[PDB]
Ligand binder design. Structure first.
Ligand code: NAD
Ligand code: NAD
Ligand code: NAD
Ligand code: NAD
Ligand code: G3H
Ligand code: G3H
Ligand code: G3H
Ligand code: G3H
Lengths: 343, 333, 330, 332
């Protein structure tokens, strides 16, 4: 009973933080009818942002025309306003008809701080492009977007590893039942790592190190999975290994299950679970092959292991994801759906 | 002074040569590869990941001089045709990567050739496989062909044995996040070994792959209880092994770390510093346990235990290789 | 016209890709040193150039591309390749091992009619950079060269200077992506080069360059020389040229001359781009006006001009353009 | 024993600190940055490109100990508010990259502050700019603010002076193929300095850029005769400078190389080995001439001359910086 809007009824979106996720979100929204970006807020001039939209190291040239103007830029003829406001409270989103804001700066990833966007002359709702705490509904599309009714003011689109892990873990649960599991993500380097050894503003002694020249251990925002799959809460934990590729990642999960299984049964379950969000492949691919994909998670049957020792089984399952575009695809899918049921 | 020969003056061969400079009673008198001495002399002097050679290297005819001492160089394809005895060589380091079996490594042993061979890699189940300070007991000195194992094996072995001896291991799964190597392609192209993943550009990709860690040969009681795989990533050297395992006893994170510290020696290191891969380049430990990455997950009375150890696939292995070579040379009967 | 590819490597595979969108050119036979499954996989998936735009399915003795079967063979000697069996008239020699008239001719026997070498092929072989000197071709030739990637970059930029201002002399530096003939890690280089021996994705590596040109622009013969700096990117390059000219010039005049010279082969841009922005482009050379310098000291001028190129796809685009044109003149 | 302070414990600051351990007249008693001592202690111990610290480092309150000796750490944003005198500091190494001018570097000199300042970068035309063993003659010891030049300047200077003194230089154009640096972005993003190229992912691109060596302050006679640019490329340190020039005299390749060998010293190295960038990481030469890359093109009586020298933008510069600091400290 959610009375969703048609794609002909156009919801106007604002992007706070025109960074990797923000710019890629903007790109995908070009091919979503009924969602449209009318306002961008960052910490720089429009020429910088226009240039970064046109040209993209890992994701290729922009599919269209971009021309700089005063106080903004034009994309395929359509003007988009640019502002440079530090404080989310001072952003006059309503001036440009913006109802929903994509919070993509990485600095306001909580209910309290994201709410600052909602005020007079501001926005109605906010989607955080990251984990946003336990008091915020956290959505991985085609896994738990049921939870949305449309009344919510602040929601989270989860992390990129969460979007990778979730469908793979849920497939295990639903078919076999999961007792417990440990996860390792072999992950591309990101903007919060230092280009060369130097003082990390977050106090992390490992993110302080040269990210494109090191294997760097680190924490992960997907262990936060109980918010997406309630029945698995407290049963999964894990960590990351940040490695020298500018984008593209893979999640390994080692787990104990309720029932006995074979490699063939596991792969078959994953193929059966496949959809627009959760992909399936039996090709021996590498990280560059998943750059720019629209799947939130791509299961790799070639890496599946089922070890049996004295009646006991450890099960290993592995799924690829482009931490940039895979997440962004899921983010926009969640945004689109949320916009149509917004109250 | 036992005189050694190196077949395959590659990454492991050149680094083995370097370490042997500081081992009294071991000395390299003959090198065999597929190239001229100028190429090899240059590759010894200058090293991308391991730094400049600590000494003098000057090219001569049919060889080169290292700190005054001449070392002969030959370019023989077939191990059968290498006249090792001419230069007083008794033991050969087989480091080409093309003769890693008993049958093929034996070809070094003939008249005018060598007496013994150490393979710098896994060499099959009919060859004693040694990780130093873990199972070098098995050597009596009568053996003709031995294996020094793989680099991941030298990393995993002491960490796994420490778990076994203290707590007892039921089963375990391993992932090594591993530097790229010479058998990967620099850019996408046909791999001569038929591997569709090693075919891909190794310095521009996360590349899944099999792993040579053959652990039951080193720790017999764990045979068939451990399996694993690799993720090859863009660093020119330096690696880390993660092991997830179930144990016979209940444990805490503190107990696990304490067991590892107690097990520490020249081969097995210990650290509580939050280090990264570049910090282990050139170390002499075969394995360096990292207490900062230890996990002990407890869910409904059941425990999964995660333990992680660093290793420089190049120098860590080479240090272990030379330690094993030194010891084997002294008991050679 | 039915084409054969010898050496299904970086250039061979990318040539194959471009030929899909050239009507009247079609690849019916591939020869390499491996099984079809390896080659089919390498066609589908490409680190730097992206996934294949189509379907690839492995068969016996070959593979299918969008339904069409393409035969695969594994013959080491070009003399033993029975090209005629598959109606092949022209062969793309892309192995890097037969880059001379003598050795490339070995394809022509009872086999193929003609051969295009995907590299410099000596002074006794017509060397073509498309839209610069493809006028040279009459169609009777048995063996031709498509030049090198740096040659295709430099040529239109250097000719534009000559035609407008006249060139006295010049020195060139290409800051170049690493290539397959470099070692992944320090090791013995089969060609004897002590620098290509070194880890190519972890070093700035000085090296020689195959663009030292008089074969493409006769009037500039012996007036240009240069070198390379190989650097850690898997593809994408840039050529810098410092030169003395016959006439006095300004920065504006130079850029204007380059824009006037622009076409399908020679691009023009005033955007401050980087190497990743030129990966996969179809221009053989893309002049960058932002890097132009004209230094004047005591009446004398040094002139600096810079052009981008994807050593892989830029060259391949030029190669296929030259192949298409050469095929049509029987 | 002259007591030194480091403002900005970054790449140059930390490496300067390392080299000062083996300089007897010089000692670091105070470090100022924007972080806690644990972060700085860790970054001193472990170094991606330059290797582990040769010694012992242990964290304390308000500082850390190095081989037993305590060094104080503070976190003051404004150079005016740094009480250098408290720790006996006379000379400050300004290594933040944010105070590279006479005006802004002078802010270190006040009551309870420092006496003198060495900027680890170009610092404008009103500040004596020194490349050691090329023009450190210029120093008399009365100066309040000096510059140690840039890394490319320290590379280029001895190579260019050798050309001038032997053959005479008419004009020249320079290209440095340079390692990426901290002021580039790790991934595509808004550059705080407004540069659209430094905005791009530095470890995944060839990135054109300006250069801080484009030299008349170091070699007066060459002023306005040289200009150039950079190509930033994916290595975490290590660089090479190419110079193409016209000369007053005719020359051969052998004569050029011979002139460079004759000019060699502790600052200016010479080599005939075909080396690559990793081979110069951590060297103490400010500039290392490579004879293998020399070219002398002759066309119709006219000559273009190409000369190339290696440098570790990090340690080569730092070696020169400390040599200049040592000498400057001695003549106060
Ligand atoms: N990159 C990924 O792989 C990835 C994946 C999933 C989620 N995320 C999340 O998305 C968010 C951003 O990630 P990213 O990698 O795109 O970040 P980024 O660093 O690339 O971009 C952040 C942008 O925010 C801007 N910004 C910073 N402070 C601001 C302020 N006060 N006001 C306005 N703008 C400001 C910056 O100028 C920059 O343009 C984070 O929450 C991150 O956790 C990132
Ligand atoms: N590099 C590592 O991380 C590592 C660690 C442990 C073990 N290993 C093992 O050590 C061996 C060598 O590895 P690498 O990376 O040092 O090899 P590499 O590719 O660097 O060197 C192989 C060398 O052997 C030479 N060679 C090849 N065929 C030959 C022949 N028929 N006769 C004489 N010389 C020949 C080559 O010229 C080359 O110098 C392999 O078995 C490998 O599995 C490697
Ligand atoms: N990639 C570039 O940057 C570039 C640009 C312009 C020109 N070229 C030239 O193109 C040629 C190929 O370069 P590449 O980069 O594609 O190299 P590559 O190494 O990727 O391709 C060579 C291919 O030929 C095959 N091959 C080798 N020997 C053979 C034989 N005897 N018979 C049949 N097949 C054989 C190999 O298996 C490999 O797949 C070279 O001449 C090179 O100089 C390269
Ligand atoms: N790295 C090189 O290649 C190189 C070579 C020659 C010269 N330089 C010069 O050295 C200077 C610094 O270079 P870098 O690459 O080491 O920088 P960096 O980014 O490594 O270090 C800068 C340090 O200064 C600190 N800092 C910033 N603002 C500060 C303030 N207000 N007060 C105290 N500390 C502050 C930072 O936290 C950081 O630790 C620049 O002027 C640069 O031109 C660098
Ligand atoms: O920082 C951004 C990451 O891409 C998302 O976090 P994660 O790797 O833990 O999922
Ligand atoms: O060839 C590579 C080294 O021997 C180590 O590889 P590994 O993971 O099989 O031990
Ligand atoms: O063109 C072939 C290789 O890419 C090398 O290029 P180059 O000879 O133009 O320098
Ligand atoms: O940004 C820091 C540079 O290293 C400064 O030195 P440079 O101008 O000589 O390149």
């Amino acid at each position: 009973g959610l009375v969703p809007r048609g794609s002909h009824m156009v919801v106007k979106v604002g992007i706070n933080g025109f960074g990797r996720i923000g710019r890629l979100a903007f790109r995908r929204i070009q091919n979503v009818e009924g969602v449209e970006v009318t306002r961008i807020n960052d910490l720089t001039d429009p020429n910088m942002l226009a240039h970064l939209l046109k040209y993209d190291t890992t994701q290729g040239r922009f599919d269209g025309t971009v021309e700089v103007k005063e106080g903004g830029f034009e994309v395929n003829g359509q003007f988009v306003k640019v502002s440079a406001e530090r404080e989310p409270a001072n952003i006059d989103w309503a001036t440009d008809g913006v109802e929903i804001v994509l919070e993509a700066t990485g600095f306001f990833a909580s209910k309290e701080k994201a709410e600052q966007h909602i005020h007079e002359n501001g926005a109605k709702k906010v989607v955080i492009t990251a984990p946003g705490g336990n008091d915020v509904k956290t959505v991985v599309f085609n896994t738990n977007h049921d939870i949305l009714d449309g009344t919510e003011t602040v929601i989270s689109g989860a992390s990129s590893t969460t979007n990778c892990l979730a469908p793979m873990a849920k497939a295990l649960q639903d078919n076999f039942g999961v007792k417990q599991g440990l996860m390792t993500t072999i992950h591309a380097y990101t903007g919060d790592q230092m280009i060369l050894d130097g003082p990390h503003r977050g106090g992390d002694l490992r993110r302080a190190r040269a990210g494109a020249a090191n294997i760097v251990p680190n924490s992960t925002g997907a262990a936060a999975i109980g918010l997406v799959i309630p029945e698995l809460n407290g049963k999964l934990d894990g960590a990351a290994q940040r490695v020298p590729v500018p984008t593209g990642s893979v999640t390994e999960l080692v787990a104990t299950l309720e029932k006995d299984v074979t490699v063939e049964e596991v792969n078959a379950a994953m193929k059966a679970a496949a959809n627009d969000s959760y992909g399936y492949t039996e090709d021996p691919i590498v990280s560059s092959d998943i750059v720019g994909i629209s799947y939130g998670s791509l299961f790799d049957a070639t890496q599946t292991k089922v070890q049996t020792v004295d009646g006991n089984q450890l099960v290993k399952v592995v799924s690829w994801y482009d931490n940039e575009m895979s997440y962004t695809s899921q983010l926009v899918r969640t945004l689109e759906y949320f916009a149509k049921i917004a109250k």
